[PDB]
Each structure stands twice: as C-alpha cells, then as structure tokens.
Chain A
Amino acid sequence: MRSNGYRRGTRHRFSQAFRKHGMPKPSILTRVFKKGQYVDVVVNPAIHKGMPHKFFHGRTGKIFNIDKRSIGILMNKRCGPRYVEKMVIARVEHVRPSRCNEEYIKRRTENDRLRREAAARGEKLGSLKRKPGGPRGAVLISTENNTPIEIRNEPYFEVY
C-alpha cells in the first residue's frame, strides 16, 4: 500500500552509520575491478548518482560490464517460480569488492600449486577435500592439580 518510488522505505537502508557520514574517501578509487569478479552492492547514500535499486543493497553479483564511472552487475531476482537475471548498473561508490569467494580463491591457488608441484615430481595427490568437523576426540583430563568441583542447586533467595 506504500508508495512505489525508487527509494521507498529506505530510511534505515540508505542511511549513514553513526559518526561515519561524509563523502567517500579517495582510496576507493584505487580498487581494481575485473569482469567476472563478484562485488557486494552496498549503497553509499552520500553519492546520489548511479544509485542502484534498494532491492540490490544486500545482494552480491558478478560483474559483466565495466564502464567509465560505473559497473554492470548480474543479480538474480525471484519472479514467482523463476530466478530472473537483472542487470544492475551501479557506480563504484555503491559497490565493494566481495569477499564471498575469498577463502575459496586462497584455497584454490594453493591447492592448484600443490597439484602442479606434485605432478612435476611425478607424484599425484588424490583428494584435497575440506574435511568437516568429525566426532569429538577422546579426552584425558587428569585430576592432578584440578580437583572436581561440586555444583549444587542453591536455595532461591530474592533481593529487594
């Protein structure tokens, strides 16, 4: 029932944090961007031009296009029973380079290096799967210098 302007209901979404107002720092201009790189759209409300829709303010998408001042981003949206790919054009002030695949890239470049080096020496490594947290280990807790302490239920008293 609410009105359907382009920034509807963005009182908190398109605000600035406490003691973090102001125009963006020039250090954002030294960020590289490449096609295929994932980015997080998070709107800088001090920058009024090139602002994406409020729908994409939490979303993360892959860059398909790179412009003079802006970036094209592929972001899927649910339209009923389907994901529809939207092309989001955003200024670079409204995006951050995403750390979504940050630990995957760190894992991949090391593991691909280790597979290359093992193939160089004629060996091979079978599987470098991430092992999840299994069962608990067996423990040994000695009572040497660690005496067991009784926990008791205590009588209910109230302070007033």
Chain B
Amino acid sequence: AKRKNHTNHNQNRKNHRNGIKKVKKSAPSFRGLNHKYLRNMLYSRKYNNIGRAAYEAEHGPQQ
C-alpha cells in the first residue's frame, strides 16, 4: 500500500549518538601517489646511507 517515501528525520540525531568520528589515523600509504615519484623515492630509501655507486659496487647491477 501507499506509504511514506522518504525522510531525513532523526538521522542527524542518530549520526551524533556515536558522534561523527574522524578519519582514523593510519600509516602513510603509497596509494594514489605518482608512480615516477614513488619509484624514485623508494630508490632514495634503498640507497639511503650508502650511495648507489657504492651499493652496486657491493651487490653488482642492482636491477
């Protein structure tokens, strides 16, 4: 039978009972980053305290 279609009544009151929780803090993610930038940042992290020329002097051609 024909009845009520829609309301937003009591929705703000419901949504504030457990509050509007924030975005939950996380570790920083590489999701959404530029791929050329992210590839280069990991290369800088891979050869952080030892340079690349010294790293490939040890481990050979690293690619």
Interface residues of A (CB under 8 A from B): 64-67, 72, 76, 78, 80-85, 87
Contacts and interface: CB of A to CB of B under 8 A. Distances in A.
A97 B19 CA distance: 31
11 contacts: A64-B32, A64-B33, A66-B37, A67-B34, A72-B32, A81-B17, A81-B19, A82-B21, A83-B20, A83-B21, A83-B22
Interface residues of B, number: 15
A78 B20 contact: yes
The listed residue with most B CB atoms (<10 A of its CB), out of A64, A67, A78, A82, is A82
Interface in B29-63: 31-34, 37
Contacts of B31: 87
B34 A65 contact: yes
Contacts of A84: 23
Given A65-B33, A67-B34, A72-B32, A85 B23 contact: yes
B7 interface: no
